[PDB]
Every structure is written in C-alpha cells, then in structure tokens.
Write a protein that binds this ligand. Structure first.
Ligand SMILES: [Zn+2]
Ligand SMILES: [Zn+2]
Lengths: 6, 362
C-alpha cells in the first residue's frame, strides 16, 4: 500500500 | 445540519486536485473506497491493485463515479427511464422538466435529453447543484473491473482456492449486485480453470479482485461527478414490443440500453447483429437501433467550410474555438470516436474535437 505525504 | 457521508464502497476515479501521477492507472480508471482514516483522508484500492491514501478535504483527489454500492438511496424517488425505485446512489434531477429524475446509470448513459440541464443531488441531505448540459460537457471512459476484464484475486479475498490459486486468472463476465441494497457492487468471474463465482467489488468497501487487464465500463461526465468529501434510445417496453420476432428480449441484454455497440453483422433474418465491449453479440429489429457514429478510425474527412454552421455545430457540442478557423475545408483523419460521438480529427498537423456533422467523409 502506497503512503502519500498529504 | 449537512454532514459528510463516509460512504465505504463508493466507486471512484481521480479528482480535480489529483497530483499522484499514475497511481490510479490513468484518468478514468476506477477504484473502491475501502475506509476513512479521518474525515480528511480516505483509503482507496484501485482496480489495478494499487492501494493508497488520498485527500477528501480542502483538496479533493477523488470523484464519485458510483455510490450505489454504499446502499445510499433517495426514498420517495424513481428513475423515470429505468424505473429504479428508490434511486440508489447519486440522484440526478432534470431542472428543465416537471418532476423528472434519473439514476446514475441512466444519466451517464445519455438517457432523457442531453441538452436538458440537470441538478446533481449527491445525498438526501445535499442541496441541489445545477450542472451544464451533458451535450456540452466532456465525457470520458471508465476503465477497470468491468465485463471482459482479466482479473486475479484481490486483497480482501476470502474464498479459498476458487480461482485455482493465488495469481491464477479469470474473466469478469458481468457486474452484479452483491445484495438488493447494494447494486453494482459485485463481479461475476469465470476462472480460467472453469470455476465460476461472484466476488465483491465495492460491497462494504471490499476488493476481492485485481485487474491484470482492465476493461471499459462505459463513459461518464467527469466534471459532473461530485468530489468525495449504435445505441438504443427507446423505452424498454417499446424495445420489448419491437423485439417480438426479431430476436426477442432476455435479461442479459440490459447492457444494450445504455451501451454503444458496433454493428458487427447483418443477417438474412431482416435483422441486425451488434457486439458490445463486454464481448457479447446481440440480434435486433432494425427499428430498435439508431446509427451514430457513421465514421471509423482512419476515415478521411473534410471539415465543413460553412463558418455559420460549423460555429453552430461546435458551440452546440461545447467545442468551438476561433483557432479552429484555419481548419475549415481542410481534409483530416479520424483519430478517435469519442463516447459522445464527437470526433478526434487530425488536421493541419494538429488534432481537434469535431461535431460529427461538422465533417464529411471523403
Ligand atoms: Zn435509471
Ligand atoms: Zn428534462
């Protein structure tokens, strides 16, 4: 699962 | 007061503030809302298998393609085309008619009048939002887990070795309702080993499947979707009455009422044979079908050289620009036929979008 900075 | 509905299971595509490259697999590619980290952050599992977190507050990385799998419904309404009652998912109300509404399938499926402007009513609590006409608005194609797609087991798989093993492949035959309260939330799969079954694709935010080859799931008006946070233009009964002695009607044909098929065959039976992106071929009475398009990719066409008319035609379809002036009378090549039947035409080295009436076959 990709973790975006946000 | 109005509040956000944390609609787990919503089928989504990229939104206006998208800045995450090709994570979704490209614009129009579909995914499932799995969960909400917070009211500002949402987790999506794309049909290509990629799972990731996205913004749904201040910035909006996602649009809702179909909320029907969440089971959200507008009690006391009915879709006046397909007669779904209550309307499940987003409600689309014609602003220019008395007491007329469509469901999402019928709205994106170009039912009613394309020149009639609609209100979007996303939830029962939503204030209605007047939209531009569909006829002047951009339409793109949905891609992902739809009929014809090549799939393997997904992250939420819990069905033993029905697929014959993790990584073994199958074909999506049809999108179905996992339950009556959750339409368009499942995919029926025919596995390569001959096994077959129904799997969750949206139901309760679950993703039992993962695309290795995505398929086209029909087209939609992107900018009309709310942010998260041949054809058949006749009623079903008329089609039914007309189909008597011309192929008849069965329930596997409901795709045809909102899907553009291509005339693949005629026959001796005074009737027609049409294929659809699902892979299915169906037979019809001629009176049931209406043509458009009359063009194919590769067709050489001359651009209309009557300025009054091409202005009318282009404006009528929301595609006029003064920079198009030097294309009048020029010969060009049909590069692509859009889902709203407008044409991508290569002319003067460049490509333009044309009303199909604004060009003539050479
Ligand atoms: Zn409908
Ligand atoms: Zn209307």
């Amino acid at each position: 699962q990709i973790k975006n900075p946000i | 007061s109005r509040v956000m509905v944390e609609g787990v299971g919503a089928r989504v595509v990229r939104g206006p503030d998208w800045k995450w490259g090709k994570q979704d697999g490209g614009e129009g590619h579909v995914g499932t809302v799995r969960s909400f980290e917070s009211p500002e952050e949402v987790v999506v599992v794309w049909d290509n298998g990629t799972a990731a977190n996205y913004r749904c507050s201040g910035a909006y990385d996602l649009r809702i393609l179909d909320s029907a799998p969440t089971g959200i419904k507008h009690d006391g309404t009915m879709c006046d085309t397909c007669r779904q009652q209550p309307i499940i998912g987003i409600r689309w109300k014609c602003a220019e008619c008395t007491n007329y509404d469509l469901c999402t399938v019928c709205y994106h499926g170009d039912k009613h009048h394309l020149r009639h402007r609609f209100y979007r009513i996303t939830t029962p609590g939503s204030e209605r939002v007047l939209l531009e006409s569909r006829r002047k608005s951009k339409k793109i194609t949905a891609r992902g887990i739809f009929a014809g797609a090549r799939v393997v087991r997904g992250v939420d798989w819990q069905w033993e070795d029905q697929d014959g093993g993790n990584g073994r492949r199958g074909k999506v035959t049809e999108i179905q309702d996992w339950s009556a309260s959750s339409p368009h939330s499942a995919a029926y799969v025919l596995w390569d080993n001959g096994a077959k079954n129904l799997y969750r694709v949206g139901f309760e935010g679950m993703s039992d499947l993962k695309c290795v080859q995505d398929a086209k799931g029909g087209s939609f008006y992107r900018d009309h979707c709310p942010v998260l946070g041949v054809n058949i233009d006749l009623d079903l009964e008329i089609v039914q009455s007309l189909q008597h002695g011309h192929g008849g009607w069965t329930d596997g044909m409901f795709e045809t009422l909102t899907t553009t098929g291509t005339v693949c065959g005629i026959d001796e039976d005074h009737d027609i044979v049409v294929q659809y992106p699902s892979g299915n071929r169906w037979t019809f009475n001629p009176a049931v079908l209406t043509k458009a398009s009359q063009f194919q990719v590769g067709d050489l066409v001359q651009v209309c050289y009557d300025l009054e008319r091409i202005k009318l035609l282009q404006r009528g379809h929301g595609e006029w620009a003064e920079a198009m002036l030097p294309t009048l009378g020029k010969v060009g090549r049909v590069q692509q036929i859009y889902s709203d039947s407008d044409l991508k035409v290569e002319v003067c080295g460049t490509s333009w979008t044309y009303n199909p009436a604004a060009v003539s076959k050479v």
